[PDB]
Amino acid sequence: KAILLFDVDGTLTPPRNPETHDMKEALLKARAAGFKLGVVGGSDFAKQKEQLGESILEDFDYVFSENGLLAYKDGKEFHRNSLLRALGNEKVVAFVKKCLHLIADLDIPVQRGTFVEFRNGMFNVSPIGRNCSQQERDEFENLDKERHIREKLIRELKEAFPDYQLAYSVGGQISFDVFPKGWDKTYCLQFVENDFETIHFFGDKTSEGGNDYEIFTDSRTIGHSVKTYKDTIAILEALLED
């Protein structure tokens, strides 16, 4: 009783493209050899269905969207959680109010709009706001490296709301994510833990700060760091060649 869990983008696909027939064929073979298959990714179910095709729920035994906040097994939903349920309304409005005050009081050159986005699994917080142009993102990113605007805000929110038990993650150029501790990819492990002797995990972003790090490092998991989906295939072929 083994299961093979895969990060999606970059692990089962070319980075920002749909899964190849090569990859599809190698998974088919793993399943008929008797492995269960699962997919876990930070992105929502629609996005995973885009990359992996429309028969996603038939092709994989488990699908964990938003790191497992929306979870399917054998084509049927069995778990749905969200940030609002974890935190509750009172804590959500307190956190967001503090974010808005903090961002309003910044002395930075450029601000636009969409400074605090409330998403199903996280707050996404942007000092400049996500309604900026790409040239503005480039500028801010450079401003940020010098002035550490995003790191200062994180410090401020961590010190204000330690009891909220939130983790914080710096994003591309203009933002950071805020989510309950544990709401990384390891969140899905509770759902397969008691049903498999061996859990392989495949991921391409497995170093410290990559979103595959915690699940890879987790002692419940046989981690495989891939550079590309073509390595994923190679590992699988080798698992199957035996």
Add this chain to the structure above:
Amino acid sequence: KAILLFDVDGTLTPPRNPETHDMKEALLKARAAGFKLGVVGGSDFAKQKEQLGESILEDFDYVFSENGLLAYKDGKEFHRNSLLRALGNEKVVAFVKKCLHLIADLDIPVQRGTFVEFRNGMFNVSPIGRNCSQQERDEFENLDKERHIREKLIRELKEAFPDYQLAYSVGGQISFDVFPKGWDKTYCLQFVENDFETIHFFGDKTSEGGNDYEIFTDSRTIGHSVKTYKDTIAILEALLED
């Protein structure tokens, strides 16, 4: 030298559907009878192209997107303006900072995310934030009717920034729009004013507070209030029957 200008949704189409072949046929006939045709609508060019079809720039002599902030004539762009250019960066960040403080200091039950959206032609401002659920929009709307949260904010911004010369418009359930005075549909009139003796305007939202009101009422315009695109056709047939 006459031109026929149309609001798009509800005027040339069923409310939230693409333009009919009936409507398309009646415009064809108006053009071969020697009228110029134009389209003006609050929504962006992509959206107008969705409703009116992909040959939009070939089917209409003038296309005015975002009320004419992006304007085409004879299939070619001739005007592009935006809120950031009108206001400038310093004024934009001052307005948005004040919005964020105001919204942070609200004593309302529910807030979520996306409180200030910076768009090409306007700020859209939401006390609860647009990342709320529909049930939350219903609740807020009811809360708002009792407590006048949105009207109070508008008063506050009008008194703070009179020199910015901004107009303010209450939206559906959760928001209001803020834009430079004159950036309603009459904005397009400067672009046809000196080229036509007669400018008909067709619109279905022509009463006070409707986004067709100013352009309809404007003395440069022969306004026609329609209930549906089928009335638009009738008026046109009558214009053409002569």
